[PDB]
Amino acid sequence: SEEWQGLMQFTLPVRLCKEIELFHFDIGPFENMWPGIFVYMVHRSCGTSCFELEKLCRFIMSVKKNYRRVPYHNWKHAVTVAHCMYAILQNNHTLFTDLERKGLLIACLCHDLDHRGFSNSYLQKFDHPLAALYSTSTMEQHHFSQTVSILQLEGHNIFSTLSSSEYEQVLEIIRKAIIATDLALYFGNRKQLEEMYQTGSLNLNNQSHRDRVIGLMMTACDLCSVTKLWPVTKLTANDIYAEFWAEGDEMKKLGIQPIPMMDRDKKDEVPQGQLGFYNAVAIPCYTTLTQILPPTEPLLKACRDNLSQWEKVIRGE
Amino acid sequence: ASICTSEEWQGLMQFTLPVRLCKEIELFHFDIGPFENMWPGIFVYMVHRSCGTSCFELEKLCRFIMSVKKNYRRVPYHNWKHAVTVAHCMYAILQNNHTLFTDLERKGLLIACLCHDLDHRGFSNSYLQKFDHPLAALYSTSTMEQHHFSQTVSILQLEGHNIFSTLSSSEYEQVLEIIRKAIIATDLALYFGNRKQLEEMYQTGSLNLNNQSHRDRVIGLMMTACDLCSVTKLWPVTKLTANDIYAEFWAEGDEMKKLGIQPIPMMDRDKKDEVPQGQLGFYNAVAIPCYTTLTQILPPTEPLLKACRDNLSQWEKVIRGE
Numbered sequence: 068s069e070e071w072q073g074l075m076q077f078t079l080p081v082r083l084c085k086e087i088e089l090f091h092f093d094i095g096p097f098e099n100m101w102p103g104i105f106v107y108m109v110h111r112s113c114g115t116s117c118f119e120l121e122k123l124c125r126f127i128m129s130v131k132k133n134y135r136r137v138p139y140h141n142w143k144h145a146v147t148v149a150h151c152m153y154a155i156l157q158n159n160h161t162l163f164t165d166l167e168r169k170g171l172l173i174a175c176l177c178h179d180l181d182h183r184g185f186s187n188s189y190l191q192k193f194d195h196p197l198a199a200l201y202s203t204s205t206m207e208q209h210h211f212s213q214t215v216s217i218l219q220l221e222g223h224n225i226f227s228t229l230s231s232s233e234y235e236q237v238l239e240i241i242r243k244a245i246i247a248t249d250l251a252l253y254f255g256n257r258k259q260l261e262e263m264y265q266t267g268s269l270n271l272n273n274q275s276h277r278d279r280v281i282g283l284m285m286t287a288c289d290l291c292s293v294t295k296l297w298p299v300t301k302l303t304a305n306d307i308y309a310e311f312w313a314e315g316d317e318m319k320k321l322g323i324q325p326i327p328m329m330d331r332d333k334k335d336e337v338p339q340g341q342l343g344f345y346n347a348v349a350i351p352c353y354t355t356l357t358q359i360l361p362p363t364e365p366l367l368k369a370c371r372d373n374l375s376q377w378e379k380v381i382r383g384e
Numbered sequence: 385a386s387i388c389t390s391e392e393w394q395g396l397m398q399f400t401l402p403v404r405l406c407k408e409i410e411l412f413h414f415d416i417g418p419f420e421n422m423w424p425g426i427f428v429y430m431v432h433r434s435c436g437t438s439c440f441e442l443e444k445l446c447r448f449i450m451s452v453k454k455n456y457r458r459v460p461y462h463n464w465k466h467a468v469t470v471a472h473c474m475y476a477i478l479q480n481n482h483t484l485f486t487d488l489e490r491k492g493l494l495i496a497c498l499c500h501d502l503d504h505r506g507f508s509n510s511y512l513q514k515f516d517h518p519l520a521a522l523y524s525t526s527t528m529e530q531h532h533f534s535q536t537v538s539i540l541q542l543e544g545h546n547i548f549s550t551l552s553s554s555e556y557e558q559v560l561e562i563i564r565k566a567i568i569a570t571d572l573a574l575y576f577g578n579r580k581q582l583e584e585m586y587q588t589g590s591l592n593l594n595n596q597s598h599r600d601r602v603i604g605l606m607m608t609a610c611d612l613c614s615v616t617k618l619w620p621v622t623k624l625t626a627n628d629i630y631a632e633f634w635a636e637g638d639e640m641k642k643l644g645i646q647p648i649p650m651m652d653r654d655k656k657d658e659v660p661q662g663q664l665g666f667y668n669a670v671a672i673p674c675y676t677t678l679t680q681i682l683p684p685t686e687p688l689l690k691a692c693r694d695n696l697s698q699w700e701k702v703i704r705g706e
């Protein structure tokens with residue numbers, strides 16, 4: 068209980084007071100500060116007197132305990148996703164309700180809690196007890212379950228000054244928000260919102276339209292490494308493949324063949340895999356997000372910049 | 385026909401190209417995919433850089449473009465993206481052969497390409513015929529293609545949509561004949577006729593470009609290299625567009641099955657397994673021979689052949705397990 072004492076004390080350096088507000092900030096070389104960076108983003112965006120520092124700090128360090136030393140789905144990725152949602156909300160400061168803004172920063176930070184570095188596919192094919200438990204969106208539901216568990220620990224419950232509803236409300240925002248980071252649901256989500264933007268039936272007074280927009284915002288954040296500056300971006304993909312290939316290897320060890328994406332032998336097709344992933348997933352995501360919320364546009368511009376870079380890699384420039 | 389709203393052409397006018405595309409848009413394998421908002425503006429940039437800045441009055445152009453866009457459907461392959469993709473390819477062929485073609489052919493070839501699949505229902509020349517469609521009653525060879533051009537004229541004739549405003553009546557009836565011929569020749573059923581003669585005209589040193597009927601033949605083949613240029617893009621783009629081609633076909637195959645009739649394999653989703661061999665078969669029967677004869681006639685277009693070879697190997701790899 069002295070981890071969360073060395074967190075109450077943190078002051079974000081003035082030199083980062085601007086850098087952080089930029090959509091393309093790389094938290095990468097600020098390891099020590101990451102839990103202080105998140106304290107900063109919460110305060111700036113939700114208020115200094117909405118979470119009682121201690122309970123907030125208690126929370127954050129515990130969440131941090133509960134992320135494993137995997138190559139990609141780690142503490143560095145929680146913060147990075149949290150950061151991006153900060154940037155989204157800051158640039159849209161009016162659309163989102165007090166209760167949402169708090170939920171979403173929290174939901175982002177726990178969204179991959181206690182990941183083991185295994186896809187849902189993997190968990191389900193090998194009848195692992197988490198697949199036994201949640202047939203669909205397997206990891207995502209554990210993540211949430213794990214959010215619930217850290218909160219119910221002594222003195223971690225940061226929502227203890229809220230109505231019955233108000234408490235069951237925010238968690239629900241978090242539930243739906245964490246679930247939405249199952250990428251298999253993203254495709255549906257995005258196609259509904261597209262038809263709803265063309266048609267024009269899109270209504271932000273409708274709470275199930277709110278859900279889909281928040282949904283998409285979670286994908287955008289989750290995927291946000293494709294929006295960083297190219298060296299960060301290049302590097303963070305290496306970490307992605309390292310997670311996948313360790314899952315690929317684990318499959319070989321079982322006399323079973325992994326897919327190419329998970330096949331380190333296939334290192335070479337990486338750039339074309341990225342280009343494929345940008346055209347099929349990333350770009351449409353940031354494209355529709357921008358349609359819905361215009362200020363999010365530097366997300367799409369940077370995504371286009373990295374797509375070019377991946378093209379150049381493939382073509383030899 | 386359908387009018388386009390006011391606001392549509394007014395933003396189109398204010399639009400400006402990013403300095404990094406100006407570089408990439410000139411290149412053959414350039415993919416327009418990730419710049420949807422920019423497409424109608426990519427057309428202007430393209431027109432202007434090919435046919436001049438006062439070729440047409442922006443206002444009239446922009447109206448036409450936006451009304452060309454809205455007369456495309458949300459079908460899977462033959463849509464607004466495909467039209468601009470085909471226009472982009474023309475542009476890049478023109479640019480590499482810029483003085484081989486009259487100012488008047490480049491205006492008309494770029495519009496033709498923009499308009500060459502207007503109001504595609506999502507159906508083939510065989511379906512419409514076989515099932516005695518109105519359109520099939522109206523036009524009985526090159527069915528949709530004829531309709532595509534009928535559709536162009538209709539868009540030409542609309543208060544403010546006529547971009548051949550300032551043309552002599554003579555030149556007006558000329559650019560309409562470049563366009564007609566260009567569009568019809570996108571009927572792939574004709575390509576095989578066209579390519580054999582061109583191939584023949586090539587092996588004898590008798591092809592001549594100031595010979596008009598040889599000109600039209602060359603133009604038609606340009607229209608084919610453009611219609612198929614998705615096979616010249618980088619692999620992950622080629623594969624993704626293949627998905628959309630098949631989405632459309634299989635949607636048609638599904639209609640036939642309903643109607644009491646068995647689709648050809650290409651249109652039957654139950655036959656996916658042979659996709660690679662359909663691709664392999666199409667690259668050898670159709671596309672490779674397209675870009676080979678194109679590069680013999682217009683050697684700067686060669687990067688189209690090289691990229692077509694690149695993706696032919698990819699389908700071959702896809703084939704052998706890999």
Ligand SMILES: Cc1ncc(C)n2nc(CCc3nc4c5cccnc5ccc4n3C)nc12
Nearest residue numbers: 290293304307327328333334336337340341344
């Ligand atoms: C989930 C996610 N987030 C961010 C990023 C930048 N990525 N990149 C991916 C993987 C994209 C991908 N790579 C391949 C691939 C690579 C080498 C050989 N074969 C491959 C086949 C499919 C791939 N995909 C979808 N997933 C993600």
Ligand SMILES: Cc1ncc(C)n2nc(CCc3nc4c5cccnc5ccc4n3C)nc12
Nearest residue numbers: 612615629649650655656658659662663665666
């Ligand atoms: C009209 C067009 N333009 C571009 C491209 C890359 N394509 N590719 C096609 C389909 C080519 C094709 N597919 C099959 C096929 C597919 C599954 C099963 N059997 C098949 C038999 C022949 C096929 N062909 C020619 N049409 C096009």
Ligand SMILES: [Mg+2]
Nearest residue numbers: 178179248249
């Ligand atoms: Mg996750």
Ligand SMILES: [Mg+2]
Nearest residue numbers: 500501570571
């Ligand atoms: Mg056509």
Ligand SMILES: [Zn+2]
Nearest residue numbers: 178179248289
């Ligand atoms: Zn994540």
Ligand SMILES: [Zn+2]
Nearest residue numbers: 500501570611
């Ligand atoms: Zn076409």
